[PDB]
Design a protein around this nucleic acid. Structure first.
Lengths: 147, 55, 55, 327, 135, 182
RNA sequence: AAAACAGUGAAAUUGUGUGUGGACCCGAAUGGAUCGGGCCCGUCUUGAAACACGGACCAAGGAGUGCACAUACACU
């Protein structure tokens, strides 16, 4: 629902506000923040967060996100990049489509699934998996590497 | 601290921290409009903006 | 059109209600006659079963 | 669908027009209410108490051993103020609990797609008589809905302007507004909200005309452009079906603005006019159709009586008789 | 005023003599003036009324609720509706078998005359008929 | 004799509609549709109708959506399929068999594809016209367990546990799965 | 520090008059003596009528709120 009354409004008239008579509601009975984790809170850490207290891995003091950013597509989705009206033309037509993945912000092609239509296609990208290359060549298509 | 959560990390410890509200947003927009308009009269036939290259 | 078809249902159901009611009373009347004869039988067979033991 | 008649200054009608596609769309009173609630909160101004009120004085606790409660007390001499109870929320002149503060979130978001849909079905409701009457607009004397005034209205004076509105049948509606003025109940009458009036007709124009400044001084008349028509004006208080006077140009523009059913509007990019989960509220009546009546099964009306255990009533259901046999 | 609903005329006295006159006063409202008579449920750890010892008073609850048919019925055998306009009586025109009207306190003398004239011709019972308009 | 009679009764009562449940939506078009099905249930024993009526009462999360290809995969050779939910497009598929879908809603891109390949979409008010004796229908269902948030349920510090920790994440930062099996 | 209208004028508390009782509450009654049942509330506590603590009386004020970040549920 888009709106509902709160619990606090029902607790008017009931002594302890739902915190108990014996236990009460004190200020900080367990400590502040995420502290105590090697000591009295060891059971919470070993159950939910086992890889917290450690150092790991190779270090580079400065990294650049733009130099490493990439996005991946599978062969089964190649025909899907085209508009539905465009798909329905190339399905019947005698011509071969020329699809450039760079134009949709994809740089690497993966070998997942089968091609939607079993007719030739030209695919342009920066990198192909070994499975992807074999699948495209199977239908008489061509893989073109480009920057 | 109890139950399962992503471990906290909220940075509100510093007592000297300032807050910035944006109640002035519609009014400052109206001032920028009125400055451009009057600037456009001072040089009437000429465009307010210069030509720039493509890189 | 459906507002007219709603009337045909109401009529059809009243006929069916009166019909089933009449069929019920006949069963109830039939059952009462079987029950009279049967009770006379069983009260006599108890009497027979008792004499078998005395013998 | 239908044609609609245009009305000239003198009350004659001659030219006629088709009706825009938006008016065939079903109405969702849930979504109109939700959208009203959120948008109404975007016009608020912030309020707060002063940032350290109640905390001015030099105060300290006396501690135990003095036969007094350990509240902070005011350090002073020579005045009756000495020894009184200072800073806490339970003290006279102390600081309030959780002081109100400027950082509260004043506005509210609503998806653009819901805002567009809510305005479309608000426009639709302006042409169903049941809704218009339901809001409390009185339309007994009006010939037909919707009203479309012609162009070539050459009016410039309020004198002639009212004569036009009277000829469209609006007299009783306008009177209902003038007689309504009253002073508000409660403290709002001190805070610049003194007088309250009932809502009346909204006039919608699109092209600049002299008629706008001829009608505006008449109580309860309200004006807006079609291209920036707001839900606060179309569904006041979150109830739909306000009475609208269209201008002929504005009525034709509704086709460019909302488009046609199962198409995309050119004026509102990414928006299309959709389908409900069922076409009408009357679908419960499909039960009586031939196709359903073949499917189902014949009911049993005969039902069992409730259990009875009283001595005398039970004895008429089960007459007991003794036996002598010992088997 | 001595009037009765005709559908209940031979039953109304049984109904009236059957209504409870029990009161549920707040615990210890008899002991200190700062505690009003209005019911509040006791929530103490030791409290004798909450723990239902014999000799303490009774507490409210669902068992005491009246039968659905008798409930809300005034001692003349009608249910009541509030009115403040001539246009309000117009609503009762279908319901006058079981409902009667009670003019709101703030309606003044000049207006009350107009309400009563309409009530006479429509055949609606008004229970505040005398009201302020006795003079 | 009696033990069978008892069990066969329990199995039946487990299928039938409860009649003390109601959908929480304030949508009057949705509440209309429920009223129809409710009045059909009290005049029939047919299991498909009872299943449909129970599903209209479940939450938005319980009514999880399906993609076009998965409907065909589960249709198991039937002509008509029924689904209390929304049908979405599959970008991986172009050609499909001819099929009739009765369902609650469909996306714009899915409806076009369905139509180009031949086939129809009908809303659930029309079921009784599409089919005479409900013998040629399949009923289909999604599964809320496939939500990406189910990867975090449980404890990652149990032995053999497949669950993922809730963690900060970056190029170097992030807690791993360490107690699973591979 | 206090202190608004020469408005309205509650409760605690006092005097006079008229009635009913001897701390008072619940159940049931008489023309009339009364009959039966009930220890002082709130609170910590295995356990309070306690020789455990707080409470002379009345009015007014008086305590789970706002923001940021992840989250499960309901609704669009």
């Amino acid at each position: 629902m888009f709106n509902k009354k709160s619990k606090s409004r029902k607790l008017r008239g009931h002594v302890s506000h739902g915190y108990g008579r014996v236990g009460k509601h004190r200020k900080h009975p367990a400590g502040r923040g995420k502290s105590g984790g090697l000591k009295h809170l060891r059971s919470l850490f070993q159950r939910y967060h086992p890889d917290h207290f450690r150092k790991l891995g190779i270090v580079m003091f400065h990294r650049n996100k733009n130099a490493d950013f990439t996005r991946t597509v599978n062969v089964s989705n190649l025909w899907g990049l085209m508009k539905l009206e465009e798909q329905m033309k190339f399905k019947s037509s005698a011509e071969v489509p020329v699809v450039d993945c760079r134009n949709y912000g994809y740089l690497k092609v993966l070998g997942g699934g089968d091609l939607s239509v079993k007719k030739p296609i030209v695919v342009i990208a920066r990198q192909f998996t070994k499975d992807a290359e074999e699948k495209i060549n199977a239908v008489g298509g061509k893989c073109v590497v480009a920057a | 601290m109890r139950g399962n959560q992503m471990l906290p990390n909220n940075h509100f410890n510093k007592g000297s921290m300032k807050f910035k509200n944006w109640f002035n947003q519609p009014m400052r927009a109206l001032k920028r409009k009125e400055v451009r308009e009057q600037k456009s009269k001072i040089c009437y036939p000429n465009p307010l903006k210069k030509l720039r290259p493509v890189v | 059109d459906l507002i007219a078809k709603k009337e045909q249902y109401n009529l059809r159901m009243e006929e069916l209600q009166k019909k089933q009611q009449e069929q019920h009373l006949k069963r109830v009347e039939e059952n009462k006659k079987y029950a009279e004869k049967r009770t006379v039988e069983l009260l006599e067979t108890y009497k027979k079963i008792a004499l078998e033991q005395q013998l | 669908s239908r044609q609609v008649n245009i009305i000239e200054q003198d009350g004659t009608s001659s030219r006629t027009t088709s009706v825009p596609a938006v008016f065939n769309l079903n109405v969702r009173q849930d979504l109109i209410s939700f959208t009203h609630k959120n948008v109404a909160m975007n016009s608020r101004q912030p309020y707060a108490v002063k940032p350290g009120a109640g905390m001015r004085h030099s105060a300290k606790s006396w501690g135990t051993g003095r036969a007094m409660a350990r509240v902070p007390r005011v350090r002073a001499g020579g005045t009756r103020r000495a020894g009184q109870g200072a800073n806490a929320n339970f003290c006279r002149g102390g600081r309030m609990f959780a002081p109100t503060n400027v950082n509260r979130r004043w506005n509210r978001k609503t998806l653009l797609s819901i805002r567009r849909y809510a305005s479309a079905m608000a426009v639709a409701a302006t042409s169903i008589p049941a809704y218009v009457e339901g809001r409390g607009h009185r339309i007994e004397q009006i010939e037909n809905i919707p009203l479309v005034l012609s162009n070539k209205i050459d009016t410039e004076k309020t004198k002639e302007g009212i004569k036009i509105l009277y000829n469209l049948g609006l007299k009783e509606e306008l009177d209902k507004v003038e007689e309504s003025k009253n002073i508000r109940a409660g403290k709002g009458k001190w805070r610049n909200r003194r007088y309250v009036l009932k809502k009346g007709p909204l006039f919608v124009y699109t092209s600049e005309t002299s008629f706008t400044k001829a009608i505006r001084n008449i109580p309860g008349v309200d004006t807006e452009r079609v291209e920036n028509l707001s839900i606060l004006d179309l569904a006041p208080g979150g109830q739909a079906g306000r009475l609208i006077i269209w201008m002929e140009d504005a009525f034709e523009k509704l086709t460019e603005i909302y488009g046609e059913m199962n198409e995309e509007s050119k004026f509102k990019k990414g928006y299309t006019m959709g389908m409900d989960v069922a076409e009408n509220i009357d679908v419960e009546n499909i039960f009586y159709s031939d196709e359903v009546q073949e499917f189902i099964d014949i009911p049993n009306f005969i039902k069992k009586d409730k259990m009875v255990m009283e001595k005398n009533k039970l004895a008429e259901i089960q007459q007991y008789v003794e036996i002598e046999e010992r088997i | 005023m001595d009037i009765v609903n005709p559908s209940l005329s031979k039953v109304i006295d049984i109904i009236n003599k059957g209504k409870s006159k029990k009161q549920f006063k707040r615990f210890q409202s008899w002991r200190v003036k700062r505690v009003s008579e209005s019911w509040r449920k006791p929530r103490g750890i030791d409290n004798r009324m909450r723990r239902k010892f014999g000799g303490a008073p009774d507490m409210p609850g669902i068992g005491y609720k009246k039968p659905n048919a008798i409930r809300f019925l005034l001692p003349n055998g009608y249910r009541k509706i509030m009115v403040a306009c001539v246009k309000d009586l117009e609503a009762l025109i279908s319901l006058n078998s079981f409902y009667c009207a009670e003019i709101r306190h703030a309606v003044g003398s000049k207006k009350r005359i107009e309400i009563l004239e309409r009530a006479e011709e429509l055949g609606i019972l008004v229970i505040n008929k005398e009201g302020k308009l006795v003079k | 004799m009696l033990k069978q009679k008892m069990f066969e009764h329990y199995k039946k009562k487990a299928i039938l509609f409860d009649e003390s449940r109601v959908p929480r939506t304030k949508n009057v078009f949705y509440q209309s549709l429920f009223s129809l099905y409710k009045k059909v249930c009290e005049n029939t024993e047919n299991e498909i109708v009872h299943k449909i009526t129970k599903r209209l009462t479940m939450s938005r999360t319980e009514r999880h959506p399906l993609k076009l290809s998965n409907i065909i995969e589960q249709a198991n050779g039937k002509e008509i399929v029924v689904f209390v939910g929304k049908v979405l497009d599959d970008d991986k598929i172009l050609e499909i068999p001819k099929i009739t879908i009765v369902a609650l809603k469909i996306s714009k891109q899915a409806k076009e594809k369905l139509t180009l390949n031949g086939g129809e979409f009908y809303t659930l008010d029309k079921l009784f016209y599409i089919s005479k004796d409900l013998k040629d229908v399949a009923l289909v269902k999604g599964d809320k367990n496939n939500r990406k948030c189910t990867r975090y349920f449980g404890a990652s510090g149990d032995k053999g546990s497949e669950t993922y920790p809730r963690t900060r994440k970056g190029a170097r930062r992030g807690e791993r799965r360490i107690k699973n099996k591979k």
